[PDB]
CSV table of C-alpha atoms in Angstrom, one decimal:
chain,number,residue,atom,x,y,z
O,1,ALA,CA,0.0,0.0,0.0
O,2,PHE,CA,1.0,3.7,-0.2
O,3,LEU,CA,-0.2,7.0,1.1
O,4,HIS,CA,-2.5,8.1,-1.7
O,5,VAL,CA,-2.6,8.1,-5.5
O,6,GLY,CA,0.3,10.2,-6.8
O,7,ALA,CA,2.1,10.5,-3.4
O,8,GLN,CA,5.3,9.1,-5.0
O,9,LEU,CA,6.2,12.3,-6.8
O,10,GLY,CA,5.6,14.4,-3.6
O,11,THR,CA,7.9,12.1,-1.6
O,12,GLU,CA,10.6,12.2,-4.3
O,13,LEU,CA,10.7,16.0,-4.2
O,14,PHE,CA,10.8,15.8,-0.4
O,15,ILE,CA,13.8,13.5,-0.6
O,16,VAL,CA,15.5,15.9,-3.0
O,17,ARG,CA,15.0,18.6,-0.4
O,18,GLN,CA,16.3,16.6,2.5
O,19,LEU,CA,19.4,15.5,0.6
O,20,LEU,CA,20.1,19.2,-0.3
O,21,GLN,CA,19.7,20.1,3.4
O,22,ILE,CA,22.3,17.4,4.3
O,23,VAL,CA,24.7,18.9,1.6
O,24,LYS,CA,24.2,22.3,3.2
O,25,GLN,CA,25.0,21.0,6.7
O,26,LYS,CA,28.1,19.2,5.5
O,27,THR,CA,29.4,22.2,3.7
O,28,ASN,CA,28.8,24.3,6.8
O,29,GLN,CA,30.7,21.9,8.9
O,30,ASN,CA,33.5,21.6,6.3
O,31,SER,CA,33.0,17.9,6.8
O,32,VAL,CA,34.0,15.8,3.7
O,33,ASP,CA,32.7,12.4,4.9
O,34,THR,CA,31.1,9.3,3.3
O,35,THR,CA,27.5,10.5,3.7
O,36,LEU,CA,28.2,13.8,2.0
O,37,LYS,CA,29.6,11.8,-0.9
O,38,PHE,CA,26.6,9.5,-0.9
O,39,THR,CA,24.3,12.5,-0.8
O,40,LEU,CA,25.9,13.9,-3.9
O,41,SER,CA,25.6,10.5,-5.5
O,42,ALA,CA,21.9,10.2,-4.6
O,43,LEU,CA,21.2,13.7,-5.9
O,44,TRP,CA,23.1,13.1,-9.1
O,45,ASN,CA,21.2,9.8,-9.6
O,46,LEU,CA,17.8,11.3,-9.0
O,47,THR,CA,18.4,14.0,-11.6
O,48,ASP,CA,19.2,11.3,-14.2
O,49,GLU,CA,16.7,11.7,-17.0
O,50,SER,CA,14.2,13.5,-14.7
O,51,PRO,CA,13.5,17.0,-15.9
O,52,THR,CA,11.1,17.2,-12.9
O,53,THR,CA,13.8,16.4,-10.3
O,54,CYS,CA,16.2,18.9,-12.1
O,55,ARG,CA,13.5,21.6,-11.9
O,56,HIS,CA,13.0,20.9,-8.2
O,57,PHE,CA,16.8,21.1,-7.6
O,58,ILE,CA,16.9,24.5,-9.1
O,59,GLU,CA,13.8,25.7,-7.2
O,60,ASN,CA,15.4,24.7,-3.9
O,61,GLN,CA,18.4,26.9,-4.6
O,62,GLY,CA,20.6,23.8,-5.4
O,63,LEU,CA,22.7,25.7,-7.9
O,64,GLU,CA,23.8,28.2,-5.2
O,65,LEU,CA,24.5,25.4,-2.8
O,66,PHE,CA,26.7,23.5,-5.3
O,67,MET,CA,28.5,26.7,-6.2
O,68,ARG,CA,29.3,26.9,-2.5
O,69,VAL,CA,30.4,23.2,-2.2
O,70,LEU,CA,32.7,23.8,-5.1
O,71,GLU,CA,34.2,26.9,-3.4
O,72,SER,CA,34.6,25.2,-0.1
O,73,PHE,CA,36.2,21.9,-1.3
O,74,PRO,CA,38.5,23.0,-4.2
O,75,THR,CA,40.8,19.9,-3.8
O,76,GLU,CA,38.1,17.1,-3.7
O,77,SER,CA,37.9,15.9,-7.2
O,78,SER,CA,35.4,13.1,-6.3
O,79,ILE,CA,33.1,15.8,-4.9
O,80,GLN,CA,33.4,18.1,-7.8
O,81,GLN,CA,32.9,15.2,-10.1
O,82,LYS,CA,29.5,14.3,-8.5
O,83,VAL,CA,28.6,18.1,-8.4
O,84,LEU,CA,29.3,18.8,-12.0
O,85,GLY,CA,27.8,15.5,-13.2
O,86,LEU,CA,24.5,16.4,-11.7
O,87,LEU,CA,24.9,19.9,-13.2
O,88,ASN,CA,25.5,18.2,-16.5
O,89,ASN,CA,22.2,16.4,-16.1
O,90,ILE,CA,20.6,19.8,-15.5
O,91,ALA,CA,22.3,21.5,-18.5
O,92,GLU,CA,20.6,18.7,-20.5
O,93,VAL,CA,17.2,20.3,-19.8
O,94,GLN,CA,16.2,22.9,-22.4
O,95,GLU,CA,13.6,24.8,-20.4
O,96,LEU,CA,16.2,25.1,-17.5
O,97,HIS,CA,18.7,26.8,-19.8
O,98,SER,CA,18.1,30.4,-18.5
O,99,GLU,CA,18.6,29.1,-14.9
O,100,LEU,CA,22.3,28.4,-15.6
O,101,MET,CA,23.2,31.7,-17.3
O,102,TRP,CA,24.6,32.9,-14.0
O,103,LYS,CA,27.9,34.7,-14.1
O,104,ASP,CA,29.5,33.0,-11.1
O,105,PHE,CA,28.3,29.6,-12.3
O,106,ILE,CA,29.6,29.8,-15.8
O,107,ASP,CA,32.9,31.4,-14.5
O,108,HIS,CA,33.4,28.5,-12.0
O,109,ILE,CA,32.8,25.8,-14.6
O,110,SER,CA,34.9,27.5,-17.2
O,111,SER,CA,37.6,27.4,-14.5
O,112,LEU,CA,37.0,23.7,-13.9
O,113,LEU,CA,37.1,22.8,-17.7
O,114,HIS,CA,40.8,23.4,-17.5
O,115,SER,CA,41.4,20.8,-14.7
O,116,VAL,CA,43.7,17.9,-15.8
O,117,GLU,CA,41.5,15.5,-13.7
O,118,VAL,CA,39.4,14.3,-16.7
O,119,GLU,CA,36.9,12.9,-14.2
O,120,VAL,CA,36.3,16.5,-13.2
O,121,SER,CA,36.7,18.3,-16.6
O,122,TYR,CA,34.5,16.0,-18.6
O,123,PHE,CA,31.3,17.2,-16.9
O,124,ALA,CA,32.3,20.8,-17.1
O,125,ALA,CA,32.7,20.3,-20.8
O,126,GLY,CA,29.3,18.6,-20.8
O,127,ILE,CA,27.7,21.7,-19.2
O,128,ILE,CA,29.4,24.1,-21.6
O,129,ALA,CA,28.7,21.9,-24.6
O,130,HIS,CA,24.9,21.7,-23.9
O,131,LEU,CA,24.7,25.4,-23.1
O,132,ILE,CA,26.5,26.6,-26.2
O,133,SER,CA,24.5,24.2,-28.3
O,134,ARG,CA,21.3,26.3,-27.5
O,135,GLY,CA,22.4,29.0,-29.9
O,136,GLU,CA,23.5,32.6,-29.9
O,137,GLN,CA,20.5,34.7,-28.7
O,138,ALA,CA,19.7,32.0,-26.2
O,139,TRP,CA,23.0,33.1,-24.6
O,140,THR,CA,22.2,35.9,-22.2
O,141,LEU,CA,25.7,36.2,-20.9
O,142,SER,CA,28.8,37.8,-22.4
O,143,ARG,CA,29.0,37.1,-26.1
O,144,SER,CA,32.8,37.2,-25.9
O,145,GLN,CA,32.8,34.4,-23.2
O,146,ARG,CA,30.6,32.3,-25.5
O,147,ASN,CA,33.2,32.7,-28.3
O,148,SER,CA,36.1,32.1,-25.9
O,149,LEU,CA,34.5,29.0,-24.2
O,150,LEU,CA,33.7,27.1,-27.4
O,151,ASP,CA,37.4,27.3,-28.5
O,152,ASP,CA,38.6,26.3,-25.0
O,153,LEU,CA,36.1,23.4,-24.9
O,154,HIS,CA,37.6,22.1,-28.2
O,155,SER,CA,41.2,22.6,-27.0
O,156,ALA,CA,40.6,21.0,-23.6
O,157,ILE,CA,39.0,17.9,-25.0
O,158,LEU,CA,42.0,17.5,-27.4
O,159,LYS,CA,44.3,17.3,-24.3
O,160,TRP,CA,42.3,14.6,-22.6
O,161,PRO,CA,44.0,11.3,-21.8
O,162,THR,CA,41.9,8.2,-22.2
O,163,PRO,CA,40.5,7.4,-18.7
O,164,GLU,CA,40.6,4.2,-16.7
O,166,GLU,CA,34.2,4.4,-15.6
O,167,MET,CA,33.7,8.2,-15.5
O,168,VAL,CA,30.0,8.1,-16.2
O,169,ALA,CA,27.1,5.9,-17.3
O,170,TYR,CA,24.1,6.4,-19.5
O,171,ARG,CA,20.7,4.9,-20.0
O,172,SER,CA,20.3,6.7,-23.3
O,173,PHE,CA,22.3,8.5,-25.9
O,174,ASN,CA,19.3,10.7,-26.9
O,175,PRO,CA,20.5,13.9,-25.0
O,176,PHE,CA,23.7,13.6,-27.2
O,177,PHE,CA,22.1,13.5,-30.6
O,178,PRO,CA,21.2,17.3,-30.8
O,179,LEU,CA,24.9,18.1,-30.0
O,180,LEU,CA,26.0,16.0,-32.9
O,181,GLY,CA,24.5,18.4,-35.4
O,182,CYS,CA,26.1,21.7,-34.3
O,183,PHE,CA,28.5,22.2,-37.2
O,184,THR,CA,28.5,25.9,-36.4
O,185,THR,CA,30.1,25.2,-33.0
O,186,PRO,CA,32.5,22.2,-33.4
O,187,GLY,CA,33.5,21.8,-29.7
O,188,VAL,CA,29.9,20.8,-28.9
O,189,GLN,CA,30.1,17.9,-31.4
O,190,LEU,CA,33.6,17.0,-30.3
O,191,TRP,CA,32.4,16.6,-26.8
O,192,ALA,CA,29.5,14.4,-27.9
O,193,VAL,CA,31.5,12.1,-30.2
O,194,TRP,CA,34.3,11.9,-27.6
O,195,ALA,CA,31.9,10.9,-24.9
O,196,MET,CA,30.3,8.3,-27.1
O,197,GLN,CA,33.7,6.9,-28.2
O,198,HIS,CA,34.6,6.6,-24.5
O,199,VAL,CA,31.6,4.8,-23.2
O,200,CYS,CA,31.5,2.6,-26.3
O,201,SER,CA,35.1,1.7,-26.0
O,202,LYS,CA,35.1,0.4,-22.4
O,203,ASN,CA,31.6,-1.2,-22.2
O,204,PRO,CA,30.7,-1.9,-25.9
O,205,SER,CA,28.2,-4.6,-25.3
O,206,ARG,CA,26.0,-2.2,-23.4
O,207,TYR,CA,26.7,1.0,-25.2
O,208,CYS,CA,27.3,0.2,-28.9
O,209,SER,CA,23.9,-1.6,-28.9
O,210,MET,CA,22.2,1.3,-27.2
O,211,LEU,CA,23.8,3.6,-29.7
O,212,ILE,CA,22.5,1.6,-32.7
O,213,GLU,CA,19.0,1.0,-31.4
O,214,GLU,CA,18.6,4.7,-30.6
O,215,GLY,CA,19.5,5.6,-34.2
O,216,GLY,CA,23.1,6.9,-33.6
O,217,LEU,CA,24.6,5.5,-36.8
O,218,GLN,CA,22.6,7.8,-38.9
O,219,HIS,CA,23.9,10.9,-37.0
O,220,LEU,CA,27.5,9.9,-36.9
O,221,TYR,CA,27.4,8.8,-40.5
O,222,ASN,CA,25.7,12.2,-41.2
O,223,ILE,CA,28.7,14.0,-39.8
O,224,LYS,CA,30.7,11.7,-42.1
O,225,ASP,CA,29.2,12.9,-45.4
O,226,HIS,CA,29.0,16.5,-44.3
O,227,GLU,CA,32.1,17.3,-46.2
O,228,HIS,CA,32.9,20.6,-44.4
O,229,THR,CA,33.0,19.4,-40.7
O,230,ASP,CA,35.8,20.0,-38.3
O,231,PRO,CA,38.5,17.3,-38.9
O,232,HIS,CA,38.9,16.4,-35.2
O,233,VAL,CA,35.1,15.7,-35.0
O,234,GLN,CA,35.1,13.9,-38.4
O,235,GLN,CA,38.0,11.7,-37.2
O,236,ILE,CA,36.4,10.7,-33.9
O,237,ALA,CA,33.1,10.0,-35.7
O,238,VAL,CA,34.8,7.7,-38.3
O,239,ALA,CA,36.5,5.9,-35.5
O,240,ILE,CA,33.2,5.3,-33.9
O,241,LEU,CA,31.6,4.2,-37.1
O,242,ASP,CA,34.2,1.6,-37.9
O,243,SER,CA,33.9,0.4,-34.3
O,244,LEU,CA,30.4,-0.7,-35.4
O,245,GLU,CA,30.9,-0.8,-39.2
F,1,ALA,CA,24.0,10.5,-16.6
F,2,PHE,CA,24.8,8.7,-13.3
F,3,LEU,CA,27.8,7.4,-11.4
F,4,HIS,CA,28.3,3.8,-12.6
F,5,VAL,CA,26.0,1.2,-14.2
F,6,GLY,CA,23.6,-0.3,-11.7
F,7,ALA,CA,24.3,2.2,-8.9
F,8,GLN,CA,20.7,3.1,-8.0
F,9,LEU,CA,19.9,0.7,-5.1
F,10,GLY,CA,22.9,1.7,-2.9
F,11,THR,CA,21.4,5.2,-3.1
F,12,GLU,CA,17.8,3.9,-2.3
F,13,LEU,CA,19.1,2.2,0.8
F,14,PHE,CA,21.2,5.2,1.8
F,15,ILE,CA,18.0,7.2,1.5
F,16,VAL,CA,16.0,4.8,3.8
F,17,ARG,CA,18.9,5.1,6.3
F,18,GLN,CA,18.8,8.9,6.2
F,19,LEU,CA,15.0,9.0,6.5
F,20,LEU,CA,15.2,6.8,9.6
F,21,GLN,CA,17.8,9.2,11.0
F,22,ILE,CA,15.4,12.1,10.5
F,23,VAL,CA,12.7,10.1,12.3
F,24,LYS,CA,14.8,9.5,15.3
F,25,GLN,CA,15.9,13.1,15.5
F,26,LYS,CA,12.3,14.4,15.3
F,27,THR,CA,11.3,11.8,17.9
F,28,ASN,CA,14.0,12.9,20.4
F,29,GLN,CA,12.9,16.5,19.8
F,30,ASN,CA,9.2,15.5,20.3
F,31,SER,CA,8.6,17.6,17.3
F,32,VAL,CA,5.5,16.5,15.3
F,33,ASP,CA,6.0,18.7,12.3
F,34,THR,CA,5.5,18.6,8.5
F,35,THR,CA,9.1,17.3,8.0
F,36,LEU,CA,8.4,14.3,10.2
F,37,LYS,CA,5.1,13.6,8.5
F,38,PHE,CA,6.6,13.8,5.1
F,39,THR,CA,9.4,11.5,6.3
F,40,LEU,CA,7.0,8.9,7.5
F,41,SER,CA,5.1,9.1,4.2
F,42,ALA,CA,8.3,8.7,2.3
F,43,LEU,CA,9.2,5.6,4.3
F,44,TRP,CA,5.7,4.2,3.7
F,45,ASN,CA,5.7,4.6,-0.1
F,46,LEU,CA,9.3,3.4,-0.4
F,47,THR,CA,8.4,0.1,1.3
F,48,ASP,CA,5.5,-0.2,-1.2
F,49,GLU,CA,5.9,-3.4,-3.2
F,50,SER,CA,9.5,-4.0,-2.3
F,51,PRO,CA,10.7,-6.6,0.1
F,52,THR,CA,14.2,-5.3,-0.2
F,53,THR,CA,13.3,-1.9,1.3
F,54,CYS,CA,11.3,-3.6,4.0
F,55,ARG,CA,14.3,-5.8,4.8
F,56,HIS,CA,16.7,-2.8,4.8
F,57,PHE,CA,14.3,-1.0,7.2
F,58,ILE,CA,14.2,-3.8,9.6
F,59,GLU,CA,17.9,-4.2,9.2
F,60,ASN,CA,18.5,-0.6,10.2
F,61,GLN,CA,16.6,-0.7,13.5
F,62,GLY,CA,13.4,0.4,11.8
F,63,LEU,CA,10.8,-1.2,13.9
F,64,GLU,CA,12.2,-0.4,17.4
F,65,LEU,CA,12.3,3.2,16.2
F,66,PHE,CA,8.7,3.0,15.0
F,67,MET,CA,7.8,1.5,18.4
F,68,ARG,CA,9.3,4.5,20.1
F,69,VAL,CA,7.5,6.8,17.6
F,70,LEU,CA,4.1,5.3,18.6
F,71,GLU,CA,5.0,5.6,22.3
F,72,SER,CA,6.2,9.2,22.0
F,73,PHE,CA,3.1,10.4,20.1
F,74,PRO,CA,0.2,8.5,21.6
F,75,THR,CA,-2.6,10.8,20.3
F,76,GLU,CA,-1.1,11.8,16.9
F,77,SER,CA,-3.4,10.0,14.5
F,78,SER,CA,-1.7,10.9,11.3
F,79,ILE,CA,1.7,9.8,12.6
F,80,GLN,CA,0.2,6.5,13.8
F,81,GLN,CA,-1.5,5.9,10.4
F,82,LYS,CA,1.8,6.3,8.5
F,83,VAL,CA,3.7,4.2,11.0
F,84,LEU,CA,1.1,1.4,10.8
F,85,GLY,CA,0.8,1.6,7.0
F,86,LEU,CA,4.5,1.0,6.6
F,87,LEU,CA,4.2,-1.8,9.1
F,88,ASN,CA,1.4,-3.3,7.0
F,89,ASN,CA,3.6,-3.3,3.9
F,90,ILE,CA,6.2,-5.2,6.1
F,91,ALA,CA,3.5,-7.6,7.3
F,92,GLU,CA,2.9,-8.6,3.6
F,93,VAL,CA,6.5,-10.0,3.1
F,94,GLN,CA,6.6,-13.7,4.2
F,95,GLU,CA,10.4,-14.0,4.6
F,96,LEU,CA,10.2,-11.1,7.1
F,97,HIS,CA,7.4,-12.7,9.2
F,98,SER,CA,9.8,-13.9,11.9
F,99,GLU,CA,11.0,-10.4,12.6
F,100,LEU,CA,7.5,-9.3,13.6
F,101,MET,CA,7.2,-12.1,16.2
F,102,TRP,CA,7.8,-9.5,19.0
F,103,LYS,CA,5.6,-9.1,22.1
F,104,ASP,CA,6.1,-5.3,22.2
F,105,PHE,CA,5.3,-4.9,18.5
F,106,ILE,CA,2.2,-7.2,18.7
F,107,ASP,CA,1.0,-5.4,21.8
F,108,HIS,CA,1.3,-2.0,20.1
F,109,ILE,CA,-0.7,-3.4,17.1
F,110,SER,CA,-3.4,-5.1,19.1
F,111,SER,CA,-4.0,-1.8,21.1
F,112,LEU,CA,-4.2,0.4,18.0
F,113,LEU,CA,-6.7,-2.0,16.6
F,114,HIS,CA,-9.2,-0.4,19.0
F,115,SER,CA,-8.7,3.2,17.9
F,116,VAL,CA,-11.9,5.2,17.5
F,117,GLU,CA,-10.1,6.2,14.2
F,118,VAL,CA,-10.6,3.7,11.4
F,119,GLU,CA,-7.7,5.3,9.5
F,120,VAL,CA,-5.5,3.9,12.3
F,121,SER,CA,-7.1,0.6,13.2
F,122,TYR,CA,-7.5,-0.3,9.5
F,123,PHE,CA,-3.8,-0.7,9.2
F,124,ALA,CA,-3.5,-2.3,12.7
F,125,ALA,CA,-6.0,-4.9,11.4
F,126,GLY,CA,-4.0,-5.3,8.1
F,127,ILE,CA,-0.9,-6.1,10.1
F,128,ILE,CA,-2.9,-8.6,12.3
F,129,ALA,CA,-4.6,-10.3,9.3
F,130,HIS,CA,-1.5,-10.8,7.3
F,131,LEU,CA,0.2,-12.1,10.4
F,132,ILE,CA,-2.3,-14.6,11.6
F,133,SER,CA,-3.1,-15.7,8.0
F,134,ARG,CA,0.2,-17.6,7.9
F,135,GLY,CA,-1.1,-20.5,10.0
F,136,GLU,CA,-0.8,-21.4,13.6
F,137,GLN,CA,2.7,-22.9,13.1
F,138,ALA,CA,4.5,-19.7,12.1
F,139,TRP,CA,3.3,-17.8,15.3
F,140,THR,CA,6.4,-18.0,17.5
F,141,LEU,CA,4.4,-16.0,20.1
F,142,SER,CA,1.5,-16.9,22.3
F,143,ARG,CA,-1.5,-18.9,21.0
F,144,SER,CA,-3.8,-17.4,23.6
F,145,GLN,CA,-2.9,-13.9,22.2
F,146,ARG,CA,-3.5,-15.3,18.7
F,147,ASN,CA,-7.0,-16.6,19.4
F,148,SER,CA,-8.0,-13.4,21.2
F,149,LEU,CA,-6.5,-11.3,18.4
F,150,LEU,CA,-8.6,-13.1,15.7
F,151,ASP,CA,-11.7,-12.6,17.8
F,152,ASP,CA,-10.9,-8.9,18.1
F,153,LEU,CA,-9.9,-8.4,14.5
F,154,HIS,CA,-13.3,-9.7,13.4
F,155,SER,CA,-15.2,-7.8,16.0
F,156,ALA,CA,-13.5,-4.5,15.2
F,157,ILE,CA,-14.0,-4.6,11.4
F,158,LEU,CA,-17.8,-4.7,12.1
F,159,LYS,CA,-17.6,-1.5,14.2
F,160,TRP,CA,-16.0,0.4,11.3
F,161,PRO,CA,-18.0,3.3,9.8
F,162,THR,CA,-17.7,4.2,6.1
F,163,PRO,CA,-14.6,6.4,5.8
F,164,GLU,CA,-14.8,9.9,4.4
F,165,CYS,CA,-12.0,9.8,1.8
F,166,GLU,CA,-10.1,6.9,0.4
F,167,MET,CA,-7.8,5.9,3.3
F,168,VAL,CA,-5.0,4.2,1.3
F,169,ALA,CA,-3.8,3.4,-2.2
F,170,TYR,CA,-2.8,0.1,-3.8
F,171,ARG,CA,-1.0,-0.7,-7.1
F,172,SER,CA,-2.3,-4.3,-6.9
F,173,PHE,CA,-4.8,-6.5,-5.0
F,174,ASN,CA,-2.5,-9.5,-5.1
F,175,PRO,CA,-1.6,-9.4,-1.4
F,176,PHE,CA,-5.3,-9.8,-0.6
F,177,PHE,CA,-5.9,-13.0,-2.7
F,178,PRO,CA,-4.1,-15.3,-0.2
F,179,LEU,CA,-6.1,-13.8,2.7
F,180,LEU,CA,-9.5,-14.4,1.0
F,181,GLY,CA,-9.0,-18.2,1.0
F,182,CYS,CA,-8.3,-18.4,4.8
F,183,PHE,CA,-11.7,-19.9,5.5
F,184,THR,CA,-10.5,-21.1,8.9
F,185,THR,CA,-9.8,-17.5,10.1
F,186,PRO,CA,-12.9,-15.4,9.3
F,187,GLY,CA,-11.4,-12.2,10.6
F,188,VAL,CA,-8.7,-12.3,7.9
F,189,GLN,CA,-11.1,-12.8,5.1
F,190,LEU,CA,-13.3,-10.0,6.6
F,191,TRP,CA,-10.4,-7.5,6.5
F,192,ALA,CA,-9.6,-8.5,3.0
F,193,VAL,CA,-13.1,-8.1,1.7
F,194,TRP,CA,-13.8,-4.9,3.6
F,195,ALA,CA,-10.6,-3.4,2.2
F,196,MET,CA,-11.5,-4.4,-1.4
F,197,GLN,CA,-15.1,-3.0,-1.0
F,198,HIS,CA,-13.7,0.2,0.5
F,199,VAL,CA,-11.3,1.0,-2.3
F,200,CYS,CA,-13.7,-0.2,-5.0
F,201,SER,CA,-16.5,2.0,-3.8
F,202,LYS,CA,-14.3,5.1,-3.1
F,203,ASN,CA,-12.4,4.9,-6.4
F,204,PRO,CA,-14.1,2.4,-8.8
F,205,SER,CA,-12.5,3.8,-11.9
F,206,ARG,CA,-9.1,2.8,-10.5
F,207,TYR,CA,-9.8,-0.4,-8.6
F,208,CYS,CA,-12.7,-2.2,-10.4
F,209,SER,CA,-10.7,-2.9,-13.6
F,210,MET,CA,-7.7,-3.7,-11.4
F,211,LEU,CA,-9.6,-6.2,-9.3
F,212,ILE,CA,-11.2,-7.9,-12.4
F,213,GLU,CA,-7.9,-8.1,-14.2
F,214,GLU,CA,-5.9,-9.7,-11.4
F,215,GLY,CA,-8.5,-12.5,-11.1
F,216,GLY,CA,-10.3,-11.3,-8.0
F,217,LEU,CA,-13.7,-12.5,-9.4
F,218,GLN,CA,-12.7,-16.1,-8.7
F,219,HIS,CA,-11.6,-15.7,-5.2
F,220,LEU,CA,-14.8,-13.8,-4.6
F,221,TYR,CA,-17.0,-16.3,-6.3
F,222,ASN,CA,-15.3,-19.1,-4.4
F,223,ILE,CA,-16.4,-17.2,-1.2
F,224,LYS,CA,-19.8,-16.8,-2.8
F,225,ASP,CA,-20.5,-20.6,-3.1
F,226,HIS,CA,-18.3,-22.1,-0.4
F,227,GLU,CA,-20.8,-23.9,1.9
F,228,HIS,CA,-19.4,-23.0,5.3
F,229,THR,CA,-18.4,-19.3,5.3
F,230,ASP,CA,-18.8,-16.5,7.8
F,231,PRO,CA,-22.0,-14.5,7.2
F,232,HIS,CA,-20.3,-11.1,7.2
F,233,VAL,CA,-17.5,-12.1,4.9
F,234,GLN,CA,-20.2,-13.5,2.6
F,235,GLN,CA,-22.3,-10.3,2.8
F,236,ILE,CA,-19.4,-8.1,1.8
F,237,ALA,CA,-18.3,-10.6,-0.9
F,238,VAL,CA,-21.7,-10.6,-2.7
F,239,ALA,CA,-21.9,-6.8,-2.2
F,240,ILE,CA,-18.6,-6.4,-4.0
F,241,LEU,CA,-19.9,-8.8,-6.6
F,242,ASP,CA,-23.3,-7.3,-7.4
F,243,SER,CA,-21.6,-3.9,-7.6
F,244,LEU,CA,-20.3,-5.3,-10.9
F,245,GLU,CA,-22.6,-8.3,-11.9
């Protein structure tokens, strides 16, 4: 039995709010312990593929909280990894785009994009890639930082070493729009790089998911677009032969 | 995205643990408040249709804490309802039957069967019915208490008024089906039929098609024609029936 019809959504939003309260406590106590880490995990997991949870996170000031956990633990890469990963889930949500065009937010993650901890930088790139993908007038912040950041995104991915599981997906669908941003080649480079990674270390799961969800057509579409960035085109042909 | 493949149940259980911590901090503060009531609803729904969460609850000192919650809030009817509804979910899981063979627990439940609030005693009766439905042999506690509790379960169901709103939700009637066959234990069949009639009449659009799809018509018809059956269980059975037939 349960409380009433529909009570499940109410208690998921309640759980989100209590987890955020724990995060706030821990940050206040400067206490990097196992339950803070598990709270960041649980939050990150609940935002997975749930626009509703991501909306709630925002509405309970979670973005300001996570800016503060980033400022209070600048040496804890596992922590920033969970923080930015959840924020990557949020940047995946189109109606939430305006919420992230905060100056201190974008500044902090443009800082973290240049970490050499790929575990950390991958999700900062995710955030920036999704954001820039929304187009020009959608960008309500400094036009010059948009133009800077897309180049830096491209450059920082190129420096990535091949990691030793950074991330897991149930679907590639949030990637496919990125794959078509020829105007902005770092967005694609992040997408194809992410795909190459997850396909390369758990192919049984991920190559299948990719094919079933119609990825081949998109990759291959980059292929015959004769005027694409050569870094992107190279990664995409690697991914294609992986299947083909 | 998420952390690694198949990493969701570690977080579910971490959540049950943290909700229990909230319960014990609110209890020590003697602080009936909206956070505590939300926390008890969250625990209730999480145990819904999942013997793993029930097990993790009992594993993390869940039911001693719920005992103390009952004891610290003797008049709070909504608290008691949420406590007892979780405990009813736990009473449905057969592997976990042994861990509810506890005098203090059974005493708490038998008392709350006589609440003047049917929202409370309904779940007390659910716990009692699932518990005594499992045969005399699985009752590691007293048999005198068992007999007296069947007599009281039956008598109390008949004192119940029609509730105002729907008191509870169910995704499935399957837990009830085994109780309807317990012809030897009329109170258990009585609770099961009363609960079906209640949800069916409060919310027929939801529960009538559900009850017909999961094969309830047959358990009900079996009650209808079985030669020796309790009158009241039979009355409620054919009422449920002719509200379709």
